[PDB]
Amino acid sequence: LDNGLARTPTMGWLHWERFMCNLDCQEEPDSCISEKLFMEMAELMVSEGWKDAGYEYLCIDDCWMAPQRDSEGRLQADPQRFPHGIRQLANYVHSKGLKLGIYADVGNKTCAGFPGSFGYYDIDAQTFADWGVDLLKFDGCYCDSLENLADGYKHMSLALNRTGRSIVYSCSWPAYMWPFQKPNYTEIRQYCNHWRNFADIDDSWKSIKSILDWTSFNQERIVDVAGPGGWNDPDMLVIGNFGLSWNQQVTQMALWAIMAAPLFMSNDLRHISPQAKALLQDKDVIAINQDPLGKQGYQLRQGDNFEVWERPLSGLAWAVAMINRQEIGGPRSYTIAVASLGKGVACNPACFITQLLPVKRKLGFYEWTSRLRSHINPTGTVLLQLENTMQMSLK
Amino acid sequence: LDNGLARTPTMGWLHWERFMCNLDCQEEPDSCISEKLFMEMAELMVSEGWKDAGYEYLCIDDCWMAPQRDSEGRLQADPQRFPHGIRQLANYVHSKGLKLGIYADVGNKTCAGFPGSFGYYDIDAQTFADWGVDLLKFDGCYCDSLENLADGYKHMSLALNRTGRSIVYSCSWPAYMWPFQKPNYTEIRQYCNHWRNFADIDDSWKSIKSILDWTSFNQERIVDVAGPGGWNDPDMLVIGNFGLSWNQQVTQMALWAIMAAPLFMSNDLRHISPQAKALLQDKDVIAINQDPLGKQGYQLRQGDNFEVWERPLSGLAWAVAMINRQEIGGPRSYTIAVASLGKGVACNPACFITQLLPVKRKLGFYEWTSRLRSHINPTGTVLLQLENTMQMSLKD
Ligand SMILES: *[C@@H]1O[C@H](CO)[C@@H](O[C@@H]2O[C@H](CO)[C@@H](O[C@@H]3O[C@H](CO)[C@@H](O)[C@H](O[C@H]4O[C@H](CO)[C@@H](O)[C@H](O)[C@@H]4O)[C@@H]3O)[C@H](O)[C@H]2NC(C)=O)[C@H](O)[C@H]1NC(C)=O
Ligand SMILES: *[C@@H]1O[C@H](CO)[C@@H](O[C@@H]2O[C@H](CO)[C@@H](O[C@@H]3O[C@H](CO)[C@@H](O)[C@H](O[C@H]4O[C@H](CO)[C@@H](O)[C@H](O)[C@@H]4O)[C@@H]3O)[C@H](O)[C@H]2NC(C)=O)[C@H](O)[C@H]1NC(C)=O
Ligand SMILES: *[C@@H]1O[C@H](CO)[C@@H](O[C@@H]2O[C@H](CO)[C@@H](O)[C@H](O)[C@H]2NC(C)=O)[C@H](O)[C@H]1NC(C)=O
Ligand SMILES: *[C@@H]1O[C@H](CO)[C@@H](O)[C@H](O)[C@H]1NC(C)=O
Ligand SMILES: *[C@@H]1O[C@H](CO)[C@@H](O)[C@H](O)[C@H]1NC(C)=O
Ligand SMILES: *[C@@H]1O[C@H](CO)[C@@H](O)[C@H](O)[C@H]1NC(C)=O
Structure with missing residues (x-):
């Protein structure tokens, strides 16, 4: 409106x-x-x-x-x-x-x-x-x-x-x-x-x-x-x-x-x-x-009771959420290639990754061909923010 | 076995x-x-x-x-x-x-x-x-x-x-x-x-x-x-x-x-x-x-998204659980006649009622003709214990 x-x-x-x-x-x-x-x-x-x-x-x-x-x-x-x-x-x-x-x-x-x-x-x-x-x-x-x-x-x-x-x-x-x-x-x-x-x-x-x-x-x-x-x-x-x-x-x-x-x-x-x-x-x-x-995110992929959602942000940044849908057991390890994130632009040549949930934690630099590992609780979510290193260096 | x-x-x-x-x-x-x-x-x-x-x-x-x-x-x-x-x-x-x-x-x-x-x-x-x-x-x-x-x-x-x-x-x-x-x-x-x-x-x-x-x-x-x-x-x-x-x-x-x-x-x-x-x-x-x-309890009644479960205990005591099955809103008030509990034996002529969950709290004495009010959380349970007052006066 x-x-x-x-x-x-x-x-x-x-x-x-x-x-x-x-x-x-x-x-x-x-x-x-x-x-x-x-x-x-x-x-x-x-x-x-x-x-x-x-x-x-x-x-x-x-x-x-x-x-x-x-x-x-x-x-x-x-x-x-x-x-x-x-x-x-x-x-x-x-x-x-x-x-x-x-x-x-x-x-x-x-x-x-x-x-x-x-x-x-x-x-x-x-x-x-x-x-x-x-x-x-x-x-x-x-x-x-x-x-x-x-x-x-x-x-x-x-x-x-x-x-x-x-x-x-x-x-x-x-x-x-x-x-x-x-x-x-x-x-x-x-x-x-x-x-x-x-x-x-x-x-x-x-x-x-x-x-x-x-x-x-x-x-x-x-x-x-x-x-x-x-x-x-x-x-x-x-x-x-x-x-x-x-x-x-x-x-x-x-x-x-x-x-x-x-x-x-x-x-x-x-x-x-x-x-x-x-x-x-x-x-x-x-x-x-x-x-x-003001761009709404979306589910990037699902499978093996994991879900990956992402959202494009201003300043060429990206939010990424990973949901553990398995309702049995404990914190389940999950691994994704950072190249899959943000239509493959997010971490090219690299990106800095900060975890926001369940707790705040700076995870560091991940280059274009590297993998990210996390442990997500049953019914929990890990929320991340990705700054591109090209953008970062620009003032 | x-x-x-x-x-x-x-x-x-x-x-x-x-x-x-x-x-x-x-x-x-x-x-x-x-x-x-x-x-x-x-x-x-x-x-x-x-x-x-x-x-x-x-x-x-x-x-x-x-x-x-x-x-x-x-x-x-x-x-x-x-x-x-x-x-x-x-x-x-x-x-x-x-x-x-x-x-x-x-x-x-x-x-x-x-x-x-x-x-x-x-x-x-x-x-x-x-x-x-x-x-x-x-x-x-x-x-x-x-x-x-x-x-x-x-x-x-x-x-x-x-x-x-x-x-x-x-x-x-x-x-x-x-x-x-x-x-x-x-x-x-x-x-x-x-x-x-x-x-x-x-x-x-x-x-x-x-x-x-x-x-x-x-x-x-x-x-x-x-x-x-x-x-x-x-x-x-x-x-x-x-x-x-x-x-x-x-x-x-x-x-x-x-x-x-x-x-x-x-x-x-x-x-x-x-x-x-x-x-x-x-x-x-x-x-x-x-x-x-060692007697297993049972669901006494259900309705309006409330459930009442009870269990007979030795010494003519009773455990009573009341579950709020409504998964929307807040603590919902529930009221039962104590005469309905324990096949009508539990609180005749009276019983002392202690709440065990969600917190421990002595409620007091209740006559056979009285009503008990509780507030139960959505998906929560209130657990009570009832001692009969005949069994209590038998402190000698
Ligand atoms: C009733 O409906 C009418 C008809 O649509 C509606 O009028 C519209 O209001 C909007 C919002 O105020 C107008 O849009 C503005 O246009 C001016 C001039 O071009 C712009 O400068 C404004 O820019 C703003 O937005 C920017 C971000 O995008 C900000 O950076 C900036 O600070 C400004 O806030 C804005 O785009 C629009 O032109 C009219 N449309 C028409 C056809 O008249 C009216 O608001 C409604 N009334 C009520 C009370 O709801
Ligand atoms: C293999 O199976 C056999 C046959 O079923 C089984 O033998 C049974 O064992 C039980 C328990 O040892 C015996 O039951 C007890 O018998 C005595 C004497 O008659 C009673 O006093 C007991 O009565 C009460 O008192 C006890 C309180 O201290 C309690 O333990 C008990 O719950 C009672 O309240 C009790 O009845 C029973 O006699 C035999 N049955 C037969 C037919 O032999 C054996 O134990 C099994 N073996 C293994 C290794 O599992
Ligand atoms: C759904 O509604 C929108 C808005 O009414 C439609 O867009 C308009 O279509 C009419 C034709 O009926 C044109 O006169 C307008 O110029 C269009 N306006 C705009 C802003 O596009 C749209 O075509 C409708 N979509 C479907 C699938 O029915
Ligand atoms: C409301 O009620 C009137 C009278 O019964 C009816 O004619 C009308 O269509 C109704 N309006 C809507 C939006 O349901
Ligand atoms: C185990 O496998 C054999 C051979 O297929 C079969 O005959 C037997 O019934 C099976 N046992 C059970 C309990 O399923
Ligand atoms: C179940 O079967 C046993 C024999 O294995 C028998 O003694 C008993 O009567 C049966 N009980 C019921 C409830 O059918």
Whole structure:
């Protein structure tokens, strides 16, 4: 989308995976969807260094709205859970130097069953721009035909544009056309800042693998259409929650950098382990994700339960990820020829190699015909960065 | 099996899941299957308090033997990886106060392709007893028919008995029997100390869930046949490795106590986190597993992605596990009536409830008519212990 936004993948925090549609503030005041929850997160996004690492969008997913529209056709923030309304919440977020994201749906209802934006796109767009919303996640639930889906997403895109406010526009569009309708990604890119490609993520390794394999399998279709202003969205980071082992967490962070994915954490920032904080705030990895060239990586090869993914970076550099898919045994040795990496330009005549994950370590110079050995944990990933020695010497 | 062994589930360490069939001592000296590996583990089992916690079987899985039997048709310890042979290794293990486990296969070949024990049961049984072996894991690979499977397992059972040495006998029998017909568990418990119900296991939550669900599904056939001297084997503990989140590890430890399962760790004892050590060595949970009454627990109910498992313990005590199977969101609240627990005997007129996992915490006294609330993590488990207040007032 040509609105000058998301020139690098959007980063931030989205409540859904971690907190869901919890409406019981009586029994569960600390994890129900309320203005208090988002204020706490906003405070912490600053004080814990999340903003400094780059995460600046505090995003409300589903279940923020009251059951009915008001007498002027507007969506209403739930009276009990958001008594001070969205506007004040937006103001609070802006004062912390952050931006605010909200959620709506292209159909008659949101996925959780609350009011949809069908036949209200213009009204709803204006309401968001007025409050000071900076990002809209637009979901594809309860849409009766593919035609309405298309028009709806297109309509909201232009409806937002007319308001004159900069709003990052996030579309579940292509996800709702699977598998028997090929989405037009040229078309989707024209109207969206990023787009959800596949099924909802959850707190599991099964989900991550499912997402990775879908991406890699369909890579020819989706990789090249991504770039500054328009990204593929493999969904929220679930690092720091409950369902992933440490190695699986590392795999997500690494691969999301490779895929030039938006980085939306969905976790409890009040209760997050120091390791997780460190991984999610890793400077070097975030830098790979945020690489200004903005070219999405891809799976280079697979076999023997190993996977090699690579991504071209600005300054003729390269990120390379190696995944151990074998879910039995211990750290498994893997050896690749550096000549295979980066279409054979990366290490010609040579390249310097730094490991970024699971730990940072400078591995040194590897010439054009040399081999690299690593040991990768079951379900883990090794992430590397390759500087070409020709480029390196140039100032 | 009526050999006076495994009166409580056997505990120890088995190399397979963690180290597999690694034969490259050249490139990987520290994780290839060697005598050196097992000596290191033996040293550590003592010095790190594993023996004290109860783990006393150091077990060799597949890929210990040479490719060929010697001229007298005996299995040979691989010349490079076990140059001092099994007998010396056994001696070393005994001097540390531990016991030694070995692996063989009922068919023509082991799962990894090494010599099988078919037509050598007597010879092989004698070889083991001579060496000082204390436990045999007997696998069901490369068996052409189900009759041979049965006879083979029966034969080795008696072949071991004839040697006169006490040997814990572990059978993959029913696991390899399942993809054809329903196993006779009365028959299996006659000849086996414990029995594997599954193909294998791995370092994954997927595997744990799969094991739990099959066990609960088939609990009518299998739970009641278990008891002192004969146990259901849901396979190795994978805690402390790579593929499980902390919560999933807790779930495995808790449920393996409920199921009166053997506790064979498969991990690298040289590189294990303090947390994993603490959980694997947890005194109270091990005590539940090792409860002398020796009754296997069962799934009490399931629904809404919650599961309740319970186990009767001696002294009219009860262990109760509650699993959150929902793999999305956060700590989900769950509430049960204490009258439902322990066939309604556990908390009548009341019970004292202690939480053992994920942390230890005294909850208090609960009347027969009261409800208990917990919050359980996605893929986690809460493990409780219930003492009845009639049994408590009987402090005299
Ligand atoms: C509503 O839709 C309209 C119609 O597309 C949209 O207008 C477009 O806005 C973009 C982004 O602001 C304009 O692109 C700019 O064009 C100027 C002049 O040629 C350039 O100098 C700008 O360069 C930027 O990008 C560079 C990186 O690529 C940066 O280095 C530099 O610092 C600049 O930031 C930029 O390319 C575009 O011309 C219009 N298009 C048309 C046809 O008018 C408008 O933004 C939308 N409104 C809202 C509120 O969303
Ligand atoms: C080979 O197979 C034979 C035949 O099956 C097997 O003999 C059995 O051994 C067991 C264990 O040694 C014997 O069972 C015990 O018998 C005594 C005396 O009658 C009882 O006191 C025992 O009762 C309890 O007390 C013990 C507590 O100290 C416990 O050990 C025990 O679990 C009980 O709670 C117990 O029943 C049994 O008598 C024989 N059976 C027959 C028919 O001979 C032999 O041990 C096997 N040999 C080898 C080397 O494995
Ligand atoms: C998918 O959609 C895009 C954008 O609408 C198509 O590109 C346009 O094609 C139409 C012809 O119907 C032309 O009028 C425009 O000039 C094209 N615009 C651009 C920017 O290319 C594209 O052809 C469609 N692709 C498929 C396979 O249907
Ligand atoms: C929503 O509901 C109306 C009335 O039932 C229907 O005609 C319309 O097509 C629906 N819109 C979508 C996008 O599903
Ligand atoms: C081992 O091989 C022989 C020859 O093929 C066969 O007759 C015998 O049944 C096999 N044994 C088993 C248990 O598979
Ligand atoms: C299993 O077979 C044995 C004989 O081997 C017999 O005693 C017993 O009745 C059978 N049990 C069942 C459950 O069929």
